[PDB]
Structure formats: structure tokens, C-alpha cells
Amino acid sequence: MDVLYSLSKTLKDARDKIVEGTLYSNVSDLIQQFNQMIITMNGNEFQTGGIGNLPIRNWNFDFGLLGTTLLNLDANYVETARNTIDYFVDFVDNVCMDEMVRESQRNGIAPQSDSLRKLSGIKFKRINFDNSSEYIENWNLQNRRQRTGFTFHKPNIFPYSASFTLNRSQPAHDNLMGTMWLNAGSEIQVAGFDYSCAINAPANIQQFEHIVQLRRVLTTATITLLPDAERFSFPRVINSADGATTWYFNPVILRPNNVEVEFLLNGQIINTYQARFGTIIARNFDTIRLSFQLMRPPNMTPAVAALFPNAQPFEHHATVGLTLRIESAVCESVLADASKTMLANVTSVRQEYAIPVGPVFPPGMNWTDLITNYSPSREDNLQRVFTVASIRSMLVK
Amino acid sequence: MDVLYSLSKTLKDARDKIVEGTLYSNVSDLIQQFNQMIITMNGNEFQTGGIGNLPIRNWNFDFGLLGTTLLNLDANYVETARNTIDYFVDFVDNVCMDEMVRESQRNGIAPQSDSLRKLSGIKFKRINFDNSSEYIENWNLQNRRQRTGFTFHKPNIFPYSASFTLNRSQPAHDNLMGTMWLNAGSEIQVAGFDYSCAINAPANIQQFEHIVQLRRVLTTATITLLPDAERFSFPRVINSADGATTWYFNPVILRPNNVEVEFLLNGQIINTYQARFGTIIARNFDTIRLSFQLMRPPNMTPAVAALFPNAQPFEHHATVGLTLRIESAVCESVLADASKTMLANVTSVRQEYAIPVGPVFPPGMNWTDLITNYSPSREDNLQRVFTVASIRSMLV
Amino acid sequence: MDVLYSLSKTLKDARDKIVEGTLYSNVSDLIQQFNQMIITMNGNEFQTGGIGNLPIRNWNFDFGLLGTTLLNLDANYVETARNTIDYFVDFVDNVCMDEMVRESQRNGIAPQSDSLRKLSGIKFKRINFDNSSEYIENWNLQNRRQRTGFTFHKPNIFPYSASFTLNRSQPAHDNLMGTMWLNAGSEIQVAGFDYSCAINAPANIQQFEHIVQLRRVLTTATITLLPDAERFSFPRVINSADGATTWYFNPVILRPNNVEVEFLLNGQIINTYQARFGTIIARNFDTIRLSFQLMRPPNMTPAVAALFPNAQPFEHHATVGLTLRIESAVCESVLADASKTMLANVTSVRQEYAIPVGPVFPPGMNWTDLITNYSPSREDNLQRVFTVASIRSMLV
Amino acid sequence: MDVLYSLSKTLKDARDKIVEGTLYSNVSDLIQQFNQMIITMNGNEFQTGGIGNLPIRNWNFDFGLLGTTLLNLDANYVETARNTIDYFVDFVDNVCMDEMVRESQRNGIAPQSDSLRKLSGIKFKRINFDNSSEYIENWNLQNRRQRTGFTFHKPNIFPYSASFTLNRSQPAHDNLMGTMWLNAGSEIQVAGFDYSCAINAPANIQQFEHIVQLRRVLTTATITLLPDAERFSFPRVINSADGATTWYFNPVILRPNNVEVEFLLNGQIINTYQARFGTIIARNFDTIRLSFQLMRPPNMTPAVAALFPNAQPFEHHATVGLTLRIESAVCESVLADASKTMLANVTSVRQEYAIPVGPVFPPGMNWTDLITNYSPSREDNLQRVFTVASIRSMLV
Amino acid sequence: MDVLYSLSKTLKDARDKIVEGTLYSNVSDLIQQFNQMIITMNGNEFQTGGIGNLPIRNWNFDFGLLGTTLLNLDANYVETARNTIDYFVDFVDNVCMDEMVRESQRNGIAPQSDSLRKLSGIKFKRINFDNSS
Amino acid sequence: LILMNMEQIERASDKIAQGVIIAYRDMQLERDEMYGYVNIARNLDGFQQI
Ligand SMILES: [Cl-]
Ligand SMILES: [Cl-]
Ligand SMILES: [Zn+2]
Ligand SMILES: [Zn+2]
Ligand SMILES: [Zn+2]
Ligand SMILES: [Zn+2]
Ligand SMILES: [Zn+2]
């Protein structure tokens, strides 16, 4: 991995810095690194791709070194370097693709393609130079088992789930008390509804609770909490839990009461936020507990009093929402997020060449299935393929 | 941890091999390693801590080397070696005990005692030699980000739980349909009971399902599947879910029908066994799903037909049971089992010295609470203490 | 097999002993053996895996020797050694897997994979060194036709069989005399039942006999014998022999009378225990003959006398039991057992790569079918694959 | 004993390491030890005696030394080594058998056979080398009055006893209160029964106590506790204490109440567990006290209330069980256990050669009698024969 | 601040670039900067913490310089460098944490922690290099 | 034998010392039976080693 990353880094630096007219002093160390790469790779045969529709490519390296007698780089020098760089970049792209489409249940963090296995030999370790990208840095820290960190803008931590819970219900579904939520990506929208508006409640308070368990621990998380849940604030016809019938949801939104956001780690309260809306910080947590109350307004204007009668039928149903958005976070594990393209790249390569379903990843790289059952073996394989994808993105993209 | 294990192994080898009359060639490398250990430890002061009732102990090392110029070891050599070996063994045992009674939340895999942190310095890396035991081998492999596993005979993977689910019930508890189970250690006994014997069930079949979610993945597991649960095969008086009243269970055991045992990983079926009993192999799984059916016997002799009337009262309740015993398995993580003494050693050391309850482990190192909430921090601390306990076992 | 084991053993020693800071005297012999292995393997091409979903792997060996000049091992030495060790360990694991998934009816003891066939050449015999594991030791003894020995904790010698025999029966199944048993794994639970409680039996004694013929001879066996068979001690609705109906069994457990457990070899009584319960020793046997009796209690209290009338209907059925557990034994043949993982390893490897059913083993490596028809060809193939699996478990 | 163990270890190492093609550097120290053994034994005449049917055997040692001038061992070297190894292995096996069949009241720890007494002379102490086995380690420790330790999986600590105690009884045996237990091997099943279901008991609580005294102190024991005892959960017809009559038991299982398991050392409570079942640790104990209560359920459904009337007749009898299984433990004394074969080996050797009963051991090496009256002389003789059995099992 | 940033960036470049098998020409300038930092920091005593539950920590620097290799770095070089890099990273993290938890109504832009105030002395300006973030 | 006794043989020499600590604080001269007052260091603890 470090050797493949170093190949890609050397090639990207060569493309960026070996340009017409530049001082040789601007590239001397880069030229030495490039020639070291050429020397190490010369005389070696590689084979990439025998899986799915990925073609078998055979790679031979017999290249001359770049010169060192120039004081400024001229056109012919740059063109020869570009020819060598093009061949090397094609090779690196193919090796990355071959590694991205493979998975192992045993040693998923280890190389799977034979090209990367060959690059894992001692003779190629000479190619290794600056490992400064975030993914390769995390890779090297994880190899030594140091505290890793991946920063995610809008981390894709919640598998998609649109469901509801009925605490009070009956076959007519005209007097319902419960909660409906969407946990999708980096967002949780929850809404507690009471059809009676807590008329017969103990002091006219109806308590609602929602627990979201993260499959991985998040640290240094910026989170926006907004009082209302726009997703569950319009008329809906919702299937019953068994799907036997459908019920009606005609919400009228009241502000939530005694809002309490609890960020917990291993069932211990790390952060608590009471009646606080806007941006909050959850420093280290794996569970979110949102508790909020529907409080019947003691004083109502004639229209409001007309909304909520003393008994059934209840035509307007009192609803209190909550929206939670994780804007940014840090996780010790790789995740899909809004800003990066690692998952997109891996899925695109796997779909482009019709890679058969393997024993590790879900049947098509579906992220909901992956994050739902984010097992250690899956974590290893995902980190490996994501690091390879980031390496490839330095050159192919 | 590798240096502590190396000290322990050097001392164990010295005890085993430095014996009167033995050829020096039988111990030459051992004596070289022993002298290396003495040289590396000489001039260093160590302190084993005062946590709990464990006394503060101070350790000094100013030992001379062992001779290397005899053809056969004699009594003088063995006595001289034993004098140093006793002190070193006492020091290693105290360091192991000090490390065993400590825990951390942020970094539970790192050394916790000052002695083991001092031994992790570069200056002691010379003591390190053969790391061959299963626990130290796993420790080194895991520090290398390498796939490694602990092999358990009768792994203690199931937190103790004796519970039931009533899918059909009433306040008088006389027409009940549901499941009873005990998940304990490496054993699962489950039983589906129907009081009506599926008299009014579609096709006269009642379906029961029991899912056990293992807290860690097990691999290459040998399992005994038997078609009856003797734990739920005799009359019982059982509390209700809220404990308000007690109900009566009077099983009559029928053969379970359409027995399907699925071993699943990430929700995908890895192994499936239909109507198979005896030894089965679950190669890699984290969940067990037992589906079975109570099938009303289409033909019944008069004695049988008497037991199952068309309606209530139901005095004989039809029950079908399964028993699943995990004889052996492999786990990435550490677990208590019937063969190894790591949990017992750690618990004994913590109990003897009145170690207060820490922020990681439950009080008394109780295994049910520990395995119920097997968090990553708990796993790290538990592997650390288990490795230290195995190291201590070589000498104590 | 000896060369493959030697490769695995050398690699395990390298992983456990080539560690940073260790004295070179701790590894000198190991370094010599490792360099010999490198020299022997250099310049050779191997191919593993063309069966099932096992991928085709090509192996080329071009490695430098390890240094012999350091006093203590440092980071550079360990890194070079680790790279070579990783490649060799992967090769050994793949060779073991390739050998484990193959079988032969003719020469199943001989190597099946081409890689192991190549390793059996003279040019690799130099790699061979210490063969200390029990499985390789037994392999070598078997090659010379010396007496082999495999020690098993809870040997899996009885194929699963839950059946019954009715010596007296009628269509209504209300006056039955017979036996019902479970012979599973290492346990035999057998119960003889009489519905009349030997009211008309001569001397009010009913004799029950159960003979279990082991497929292989067991020696130095420790057996727990308990008077009662709890598995057949509760009410039970049991299918008829042809499955055309079900009968009722309402046991009341009387202690067995004149218990005689004989352990027979070639039909001759090697051991015999009369009314002995607890731990007994069977030194050499291939058959277990459990003969017991239901003796009608000559003196009964009013409740007991109420259980057993003078004639039908018989609502309570007198049952005597026997439980026999083989805790440990020694066999000249390989067997599955609770403590080892050879059967699990072979079955897992065959299931993971979807190895088609061959001409030797049952589909899925079903142990009950394997031990039911434990033929010499099956024995040879099973010993081969179990030895390869033990070799593989040293590294994987 | 250490010289005999060293002979066996040298022979085992020679069998394992002296293989064709191996580097001489892999065996140099082993070859030196082997040649030293040959020199020491050469010219000595031994006789393994004719106690019982064991044949008298005469042993003469005139063997040439193994060569030291090869780079790799070849077939000539291996054959020359193997002839001597075979003869020496036969001699060691016969010496071990001679020692295992012998005992004495006075000095049972000392050698009994003439051959082992001869090997205890100083002129054989040169043979002594690595004493790494658990049994030989403990033998050397005990010869020095040091703290010994044997790790047992399922130790056979409880002598077999299926007994009952009736704290309330009468000739009819229709209103009984008491306890019945099976203490076998590592398992204690106990069950307290009340026929009246504590209708007239104070507070409707019936207290049951079971004290089991271990004949040796167990340390670092992991124990599984389970609420119910399946062995006393089915209807039985149990003989009376005098055997004059039989009474009837028809249990209905209630959960035990206020369960207290105390592990005591010299009457001092070392460990206490209240209402905890899953898995517990007893760090150091010699007595187990199981206290458990039958509590009449204050609220009953109509069926449960039907089970338990206000007065006689009592047809359903309320029973509260308890199962206690020692999975593994540590003992300073040797014990039979489910994993080792020492007891089996000694019993087999004594049975096969018709050794007459001696003053120390009970006839047939019956383990129940042995552990019931585990005297110091019995402990010494048993440790001697078990160590010899472990030595013999290294080669046979 | 610029000196603290330069320490942190020197350590980041040391972690990223001092890797086994890399050409010594890939790190020559970085090694020179790192050795200059070692020279400037050696013999200085620093204290962090003492506010809230942030522990009081004492930092001493008595490290030797990173050496040179003819062509490529080996494993020994990387471990020897990593010991020093780990200590310096711990020190920098502690200094940053000490500075983050402090505030001042007057001169809020100026360093508030004693360690950062000491790092603003002239003697440490030598450590200052590329300020590119 | 020579390797394990090297340090002892070297430290027995009367014409070479094993090092010199430059500590710019004033340290009391040790009182040694072989010298009287002597600026002798028993070990190098507390000093950077070059
Ligand atoms: Cl956005
Ligand atoms: Cl067991
Ligand atoms: Zn509904
Ligand atoms: Zn209920
Ligand atoms: Zn066992
Ligand atoms: Zn029938
Ligand atoms: Zn009685």
C-alpha cells in the first residue's frame, strides 16, 4: 500500500513539477525519486486483473533514467518524462483497480491483488517516500496501531431507516401516540405525535424518546439541532406495522418541550444539551438519546382550543419534532461522507467490470447494508479499498 | 508485555533446565539469555504499586552472572542460580499482579503499572526472546495488525439468561404459546411450547424461532445439536414477566419438526443445517437462528389422543426443544472458557487484594455483565489482563 | 507431509523467536534452519489451487539469507525476516488448503496436491527438522507401521442415533417393553422401559441389553457411568417405527438393577463393572455391552403401589436408565473430539471454497456419516487432511 | 524419577528431531545429551521385575555413540539412532510399568522398583536435563517443599454419591421434606423437595442446605452455577434409607430462592455469591455450602393453586434445584480429570497384568474409594505413579 | 504561535517523510530542520497544564540528532527517529491543549500559556519555517 | 566468556575511565576509600549522553 501510494505520489509530483522551463533545482530531489522508482521497477513483470470483466494486463518495465545534466527543463526532456509517466500511471491505475475489486474474509487489510503482493516485497520498499495524504497517514498509523482519525463532512453514519413506533394505538388508528423517524446519512429527523394532545396525560405532558445507536464512535462532532422536523409535519397516509391497513396522520406542530440531547459512550453520559438549539459539540459518543415532551398549552385562543377537543374524534394531531444534522465529525474508521468520493469510486469500479458478489461486502456495495453490519473484517476491507481508491484518485482523477 | 513475558519465560526455562547434573550444552543458550536479562535489569529500581491491599514493593537488581564454564551442572551451580531465580520470579509475579488489577478507558491495551511502562522502554528490549505462547503470540500478531485467533474449548460466549417469550397468553396462563430458553456459557437450550398442541393452527403446525446474537464472531466452531431440551422437559412453576403471579408448565415432549439451524454473519446465512443432529461445523458466524416447528401428530394412539383435546382445559402441553453446545471454536477476541484459567486468575487476584471497582470492568469481574457489554475498551483491558495472567501462570 | 510440517514449524519458530533486541544465540540454530529452507526453496516454482473456488496461486522463491553477524537482533533484521516469513507463511497456508480439499480412493494417505508432491522429492528433504507435534509424530510412526496414538478429550466415536427397540408392543402402544437410546458423540444414554413394571415377568425382573459397537478400538479410556438417563425420563410422544402413528411414554424412573457394563475386545470381556458408578477405566475395547434390569419393588408405599397396578391400563411406565460418557480416550485412528479443531478446519476450508463432493468423504464432511462408514480409505484420507490441518493451524 | 523422566524426554526428542536430511545444528545439543545418556547407561544391568503377571525382563546396555561429524543427517544416521532409540524406549516403558504397579505405606513417594532405585544413584544424575513437564515440575517442587500446582479441566474431586436426606419423613412417605443430590466428578446436582410446598412453614419458606467437603483445597476455580437440577426433576421411585420400602417422588420445579453459594477455607467464607448463576470464580476453598430456599409463590394461577393444596394428599411435590460444575481448577495435589490419562494409564497397567491389591490403593484403582479417603500416604503413592504414567505417556 | 506551528509541521513532515526505504535526499532538508529543532529545544524545561483537570506535565529535551544514510533510510533509522518524534508530538499536543483552554480579555491574541510564552522568545525563532497553512 | 567479562576487565583498568560528566553546577567531591576526595561518578543517570 505504501509502495503503491509512493508510486502514485511520485507520478503526481512528476506530472506537476516536471514542466518546460523549470529550474532543475526545483525537481532535483523529485528526479532522484523518479529515477529510484525506475531502477526499482526495471526488469519486473506484473499482471493485473482476472476478476469480472477486468482485462488481464501484463506490464513490463524497461525505461531509461531521466537526465540530470540540465539546468532548466526543456521540451524534449519533459516529453520523454511524460511518456514514462503515462506508462507508469496506466500501470498504477490498473493495480489500484485490481486491488479495489477484491476482498478477503481473513486478512482484508492485507493486499489481495498479486501486483500489490509483489509490490509488498523488500526490493520495492526503496520506492517508499513521503506519505502525507490523510488516508495513507491513517493507514500507517493503523499499521502501528496508533490512534487513527478520519475527518468527515456530513459523515454517512446512519443507515437509512424510515419507521415509526406506536405506544398507544388501536385498530381504528384514530387515537395514536408514538414516534416516527427518518435516520438517513448524517441526519436524524424524529417526531413524537399524540392524537389527543395529552388531554388525559399526567399533567398534560407526553414524553417521547428516541435512541440512535451509531455503529462506530464519533469524536469532535459539530451537530445542528433544530426544534422542528419538516419531514413529519404534513398530512400522511401511513401503512400499519403489519401492512394490513393504512392510517391517517394530520399533524399540527407544537414546539417541543424540555428538549434533551444526550451523547453517550458505552452507556455513559458524555454530553448533555437541554433546550439548546443551533450548533452543539459532541466530543466523543456512540449513542444519541433525544428526549422531548409534548406539553399541552394551558392557554389557547379560540382556534387553538377548537383544534384539540376534550375527547374523540381528534381531527388535528399534536406533533413535536426534532432535527439533528452531523455537519462534521472524526471517526477512527473509514466512512462514506458528503465531500469525498472513495465509496463512489470503489462502487463505480466494481459496477463497471461486473465484479461478482464476494464474501465480505453487501450484494452491490450498498452502503445501508455495509454500515448496518459494519464488522471488523468489513472495516479492514473497506479501509483497504478506500485507501487504494484515494491513491488512484491522485492519478486517474 | 513482550519484555514481561520474556522475563517470565526465561525464569520458567531456568527453573526447568538448570538442574543438577545436566550438560551445560543443554542450557547454554538459556544461560546466555539469563545473563542478558541480569545485565539489562542490573542497576534499575522498580516499584510495584499500592493499589488496593496490594503492598508497595521496591525492587533492586545487583545480581552477578551465572557461570558458563562447567561440563555438567552441579549442586553449587543450581543453588547459586536458584538464589537469583527466586528474586526474579517474585518481581515478575508482583509486576504481573500490579498490571492485572489496573484498567484504563482511553488506552486499555497499553501498560497500566509503572513497572510495565518502565519495562516498555527501549533499554529493556534486549530481554526480549522467544514469544511462543498462544496469548503472547496473539498479542504480537495483533500489534502487527495481523489476523490471529484464540482457540477455546467450550467458549463462554453466551451471557447467562434464563427467559421466556409468550406469543400467546392470558391472565390465567392456561392457553400459552411461546418459547423458553437458557443461554449459558457455551450452551443454548431452547424449547417452544404450545398448550393447545396446534389444534387451531394453520396446517396444525406452530412455528418457533430463537435468535442468539453473539457478541463476537466465532470461526471453525464444532457444535453438538441435539433434538431435545431436557432443561424444559419437566413440570415447572414459572413467574410471570412482571412477577405478579406464577403459571404452570407441564411439558409433553414431541419431536421438533423442520429443524433449521442457521449460522449467520452480517445477516447473511453462512451455514445451514436442516434436520441434522450430532456434530456440525459453523465456519464463521456471529448469529445463530434456530427455527423449529411443533407438528401435531396426524395419527395418535388412544393414550396420545387423550393428552391433546380439541379445546381447553389443556393439562398436557406440547413442547419441542433443541440443544446447541459449542464444544470448540476460535475467536479474534479473548473469552473465558472451560479449559483456561485466565478469568479465574484475574478475578482471584482482584478479590484477594480488595481492588475497588474500576471504570472498565463490572464489580467482581462478573463474566455475565462483562460479556453482555463487551465494549472495545473492555476488550482491550481484558486482553491485556488475560495476557498478563497467562504470563504469571508460567511462574505461579 | 514432513517437509510441509517442517516448513510450517520453521516459520512458526521464526515468527516467535526473530524479535527485536533478542540475542542472536537465541536464534542461531533457527537462523541456520531458516537459511537452509531458503536455499532449498530458492529457484522453485509452485502452483496451488485449481479445485472449487480455491484460486490459482503461483509461487516463486527468490530470497536472501538472514544475517548471522549480529549480537542482538535489530529492526532491519526483523523487517527482512518478517517479509520473507510472510511470503512463506502464505505459501504454506495455500499448500495446506490445496491438500485439505483433495481426496483419493486408492492412495488417500499419499499427497494429492501437486505442490506437496513436489515437496516430497529428495531435493526438499533437507528442510526436514524437528517433528514434535502429535499429529506429525503419528504420521511418522504410521509410515514405519509403529503403534500410533491420538489422545482425545470427549472423543466423537458414536455416530448420532436416537432410536428405540420394542421387544413387546401392540397397535395401541399401551403395554410396551423395550429400550430407547441416544448414542451421540462421546455419550450413550440408554433407558429400558416396561409399562407393566415387570408384574408378570419371571421373578419380577425385566432384562435390558444395549450393545454399542465402536468403529475403532479405544484404549486407556476414562468413562463416567451414571445410573439415570435424564434424556428419557420425561413424558414424550414418540413416532412409531414405521411413522404411521405416535405413542405415549410417561416414565417413572426406578434405579437400574444388576448393572453390568462390559467393555469387550473381539467379543472377549476385557473389562467388567458391576453396580459401579462414577469414574471407571476401560483399557482396551471395541464394544460396550450395558446390561441392566428393571426389578419390581418388592415393597411399595401406598403411592408407589398406586403407580403400578396389577394389569392394564398402565398409566405410569417403569424406566431404568444408564448414562455413559467417555471423557478421554486413546485411539490408533484420527477422530473428531471436543478439544481439537481439525474436523472444523477441514470442513470450513471445504465449505468456503465450495469443494465439490468427492468419492471418499460424505457431502459437507458430515461426521455422523463419516464415522458410520469409517472405511480404511476414509481413514487414510481423514488422517492426511487432519495432519495437514494441524500443520496449517500452526500458522493460520 | 527425574532421571527416568530425562531418559524419556531424551528419547522423545531423539524420535522427533533425528530425522533424515535435517541439519546437524538442529540436533547437536540433543545428540550430545543422547551420547551422554548412552555413556551413563552403558555397562549397567537392569531388571524390570515380575510383580503380578508383568514378565521379568533383563536389560543390557552396550551401544555405540551417535556420530557428530555430519552436516545433514542421512538415512544411515537415522537408522543407527533408531535401533538404540527403540531399545531404550522399551526399557523406559518397562521401568515405568514396574514402578506404576507398586506402592508402599511408609515411603510411597520414594522409588519402589529396583530399576528406578538404581536410576536414583548419583552415577545416573548426569542424564538429568530439562524438566519442563507439569508433572515433573511439580515433582521437583514437592521434593523441595515448594508450592505445587496442577491445573485440571473438570477435576474429579467429588467422590460419586447419589444420596438423599429426609428432614421430614414417616412410614407412608407421602409428606416428605429433604434434599437429594448427586456429587459426581466435577459436578454437584442438589435438589430440595417439600411435599407440602411450605404451606405450614414459617413465612412459607423452606430452607435447604447442602455442604460438600472437598478432600483437597482447590484454587483459582471457575464454576458454572445453574438454577435447576435436571437429575431430580422427573418422577422417581426411590428406595428407603434402610431399603425396606420404596417411596414416590413427583417433582414440580420451582425456582430456588435466596440462593447463596459460599466457598469456605477452614470454615472461613472466602467467596460468597448471592442470586448469581452464570459463571463464578472461587479463588481458594475446600468446602462448598449451597443454601437455597423453596418459597411458596404468594400469587398463583388456578392451575398452580391446584397443584398445592392446604393439606394432604400431596400429589405434586415442590422441588428447587441447583447445579454446580467445576469447569477448571488448580490443586496442590494430583487428581483425575476429564482431560488427562494418568489414572486411566495406571489402572490399565494394573488391570492388564493382574496386580494384586496392595496396602495403599483400593482394588481396581477405584477412584471413588481413592478420593473418598485421600490419605497422605495415598497422595504420595498416587503422585509417584501418576508422574511415572506421565513419563510413560511421552513415549507410549 | 509561528514557532509552535513550525514545531508541529516539522513533526508532521518527519512522520510523513521519514519512512523506511526512502532516499535520504527525500528528507535531507527535513532532517536539517529537525536537527535544528532538536538543538534549539535541548536543555530547555517546559511545563504544561495546571488548569482544570489538565494534568501538570514537565517536558525535558535531551535528544541526539538524527543521523545520515548514504542512499536510503532503514528500519533502525525510522524507529530511532520515531522515539524522538513521539515525544515531541506529545509535547506539542500538550502545549496546544494548554493554550486552547486559556483566554484573556486584554491581549487575547497574545500567548496565554507559559509554554507558548517561552516559545515566543528569540532563541526559538530558529525553529520557524514554512508557514503555509 | 570474554564478551561477558569485557566490561569488568575494562573498568579494572587504571589508565582509562568510562566517561566524563560536565555538570555546570557545583557537585561535592565523593569520599572514596581509594582516593580520599574524588570527583567520581558512579553512574551517568540524569545527564544526556554523547
Ligand atoms: Cl453540505
Ligand atoms: Cl468438557
Ligand atoms: Zn397500526
Ligand atoms: Zn405471563
Ligand atoms: Zn472438556
Ligand atoms: Zn410402535
Ligand atoms: Zn424413607
TrEMBL record, chain F:
Compartment(s) where it occurs, according to its Swiss-Prot or TrEMBL record: Virion
Domain of life: Viruses
PTM comment text: Sumoylated with SUMO1 and SUMO2. Sumoylation of viral proteins seems to have a positive role on viral replication.
Family the entry assigns: Belongs to the rotavirus VP2 family.
Function: Inner capsid protein that self-assembles to form an icosahedral capsid with a T=2 symmetry, which consists of 120 copies of VP2, with channels at each of its five-fold vertices. This capsid constitutes the innermost concentric layer of the viral mature particle. It encapsidates the polymerase VP1, the capping enzyme VP3 and the genomic dsRNA, thereby defining the core.
Note on domains (UniProt): The N-terminus binds RNA. It is necessary for encapsidation of VP1 and VP3. The N-termini of 10 VP2 molecules form a cylindrical hub underneath each 5-fold axis of the inner capsid.
Record text on subunit structure and interactions: Homodecamer; each decamer is made up of two conformers of VP2, called VP2A and VP2B. Interacts with a VP1-VP3 complex. Interacts with the intermediate capsid protein VP6. Interacts with NSP5. Interacts (via N-terminus) with NSP2.
Protein name per Swiss-Prot or TrEMBL: Inner capsid protein VP2
Span covered, complete protein: 691 to 740 of 887
